[PDB]
Design an enzyme around this catalytic site. Structure first.
Site, short mmCIF file in Angstrom:
data_model
loop_
_atom_site.label_atom_id
_atom_site.label_comp_id
_atom_site.label_asym_id
_atom_site.label_seq_id
_atom_site.Cartn_x
_atom_site.Cartn_y
_atom_site.Cartn_z
N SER A 90 0.85 -1.18 0.00
CA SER A 90 0.00 0.00 0.00
C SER A 90 0.89 1.24 0.00
O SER A 90 2.07 1.16 0.33
CB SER A 90 -0.85 -0.03 1.28
OG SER A 90 -1.59 1.15 1.46
N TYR A 144 -4.07 -1.20 9.62
CA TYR A 144 -3.83 -1.28 8.18
C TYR A 144 -2.38 -0.90 7.84
O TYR A 144 -1.67 -1.62 7.14
CB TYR A 144 -4.80 -0.37 7.42
CG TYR A 144 -4.82 -0.61 5.94
CD1 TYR A 144 -5.56 -1.66 5.40
CD2 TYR A 144 -4.08 0.19 5.07
CE1 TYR A 144 -5.57 -1.89 4.04
CE2 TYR A 144 -4.10 -0.04 3.72
CZ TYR A 144 -4.86 -1.07 3.21
OH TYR A 144 -4.88 -1.34 1.85
#
Lengths: 253, 253, 253, 253
Positions: A145, A158
């Site tokens: 990410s 996350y």
């Protein structure tokens, strides 16, 4: 002839989370390149199956909760039973939970870490065992990410999980490269999928992001087809343990 | 159909430094994918020309010192006159100078910086002007190094220049991505070329380095064919400003 | 007792470009920690001299164009004649030139590179030789940038030079650690100085950048005092070749 | 006067895992700088208590398993009762489990992740709540690793957790900077402690790693005293979300 190196005819790819969005894009891309596809999803990925079978490729649809690590061996065994071998793994199944860090619940920690990093390590392990048995190498593509590189806000589990993905990708390469196994990651940028739906419904927030993307557009699932085929192919044989950003220049800015 | 996205038929690639080693490999790879080739070298790239023309592709051989920035516009003009357009630039022309940092001469500084970073920026600018005129986007592939990430020893100007390459790749993407220009870099690992000839001839050092490459082998020019074609193609449209290591896991270890 | 490790009593610190802004802050901080200062400047650092002298410390004010690498040996010779030794170097002298990359002039390239990276390497070399002659080690602190990490826009030679600074800092540490020399860098964030004059005036841009600084304020020369004293002292002896961001969280976001 | 900015007189620092090695070193360094200490350990930190009290500082010794996140609130409540406030948190409590990645057990995953990242997040959260209640800001120092940057081998959960630490440090800074809270990390290199006992016993491997440390020596707990005081003090106020390597040049080479 180099174009033959990208051709995935005869290959078998197992992609977790390919009913929608980025995972669906990667599944379709790998199928267009010649792969038969094994999907692992929470629901039958009807649209993906239609698109893959329309290419003349086969789709084995498995329904399972990827967070359950005791179930991974069975998933790989089904794949191997149908096709005889598994050659490529894309660890795309993931979730996100948004909550102020100061309030962040144990549930929002555990659920995200369990899927986004723990299941990724153990599914990689499960498939790598099969690669080693087969003796013809293999490809693992993890999904990192922008939050592997930057902190972000309101998503501590996350950021933790995706930063961990970039790290474990390195270690997996270190140990398994000697078997002709390439473990790499794709870090998508800001992609126009369900995960950025809230962000994009806000005109002002949406523009704030878009103006900071050098390419001047959001990413789409289609943008991961080429990078995923590349990393799944012999064209990237000396790339290992590395994260490639597919971000329209986000990290460059 | 994604395999078509890797196909470079009809494309024109200008590669600086392609008489030998890595540059020769990238030129051949690009030609195999369909590109006609414009070479810029100090001497005739005789072997490269033979191989490229054997594929049925065209090769325009320009002889020039890339460090002379006033000469770039004419090189690009000649490329454009011969083929009608230039679509891809690979900035491979480079040198290295080894000398204790404490003794390092101004000559060994200037010569390396002039070629490895100054000429790279100005050739990129020159070609980018042509891309913008054409209006069909373009690709720039710079050549970074493991010494873009690590310091190394006895090559201050090389480390400076290659670290600069990684940075300026980001900025070029930031400004030009809006025109459909992708500026990215390949960072080769330890490759079997003349640049590592002395290292590879010493069995102690050689083994020490190889034992820290997860792949357990040196990289070859052919290992850059896939990555260069990928970054020169539509298959990497949403990758911009980014450096991809082709290093057998060197950075991961 | 650990607080004694930060004490720079009896040390001599050479800081380039300390008439104003960040360099002035670091010189004053080093002086407060016990350093006598050698300045190298284009204009007399009157204010800095007053403040260093008011602390009861000595200030040797040398005037020179730091880009002239042939003059460096003399500058260090002068410092040694006056103070007997040099223990600390801060390579802060630098410039920036803003111009669209597609138009960027050779002048705006050379002027920035000559000062921001070439003169930094050669001054570090010059002082390192002196450190080696003295035989008691030494400290070098280079000044990186957010544009050592990100590309930015309209400053290709600045991004190139500052990325190069981060890299060459690594190599200097590798080669000169055996001489008891620590070479590290400080990467300031957005600091309120003459450099960010344009930015901070523009009300819209200013708010856009401030909202992306977690600290919620511009950096100050004062913010580099602690970090520069830390890196100039025995409290950081096992930090080498490393760049520390003093950026209010810019890179974290 | 800048030396006063390193002085931690009147501060209270909570250090988890400070009975031996690096944690002990940091507890003693903070105590030497003025801090009263709250320890959280499995076993009684006898030697540390003696050394801290010998300096004339207080040591509150708490006994608890840091992985039990429900217990954190009470630990901080006791610290607050006993000293009136908590100003600094050092999240040092951690473990490592070595096993080939292909065989790696779920236990060796969970035990390491639970302590090295999960408990680090939740302990940080718990202390942050107190920093906010107090209204005078605070400092958090997380413990990263070379395996935050590189993959290593046989320690997938360690690499995952430490890569996660580096990432979550960024997010914590982003979100909590508004509360006057700095969150940074120290990444130790190869340190001579219990954790590297085997490595340093094996003289072949010991020397080859040692040869790749520019400093030419193993790190020691004392090497973390200065950097921990620095990151715990007002001298590092504009550093936030950043990881500082204390590695003798390991990452530079």
């Amino acid at each position: 002839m180099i174009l033959n190196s990208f051709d995935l005819q005869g290959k078998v790819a197992l992609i977790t989370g390919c009913d929608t969005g980025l995972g669906q894009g990667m599944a379709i891309g790998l199928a267009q390149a010649g792969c038969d596809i094994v999907g692992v999803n929470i629901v039958e990925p009807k649209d993906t199956i239609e698109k893959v079978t329309a290419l003349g490729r086969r789709f084995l649809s498995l329904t399972a909760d990827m967070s359950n690590v005791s179930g991974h061996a069975e998933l790989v065994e089904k794949a191997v039973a149908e096709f005889g071998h598994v050659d490529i793994l894309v660890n795309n199944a993931g979730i996100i939970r948004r909550e102020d860090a100061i309030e962040f619940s144990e549930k929002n920690w555990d659920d995200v870490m369990n899927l986004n990093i723990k299941s990724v390590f153990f599914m990689s392990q499960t498939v790598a065992r099969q690669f080693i048995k087969q003796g013809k190498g293999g490809k693992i593509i993890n999904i990192a990410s922008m939050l592997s590189f930057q902190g972000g806000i309101r998503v501590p589990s996350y950021t933790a999980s995706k930063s961990a993905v970039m790290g474990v990708t390195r270690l997996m390469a270190n140990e398994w490269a000697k078997h002709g196994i390439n473990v790499n990651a794709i870090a998508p940028g800001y992609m126009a999928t369900n995960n950025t739906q809230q962000l994009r419904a806000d005109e002002e927030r949406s523009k704030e992001i878009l103006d900071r993307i050098p390419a001047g557009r959001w990413g789409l699932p289609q943008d991961l087809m080429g990078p995923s085929v590349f990393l799944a192919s012999s064209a990237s044989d000396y790339i290992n343990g590395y994260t490639i950003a597919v971000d329209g220049g986000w990290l460059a800015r």
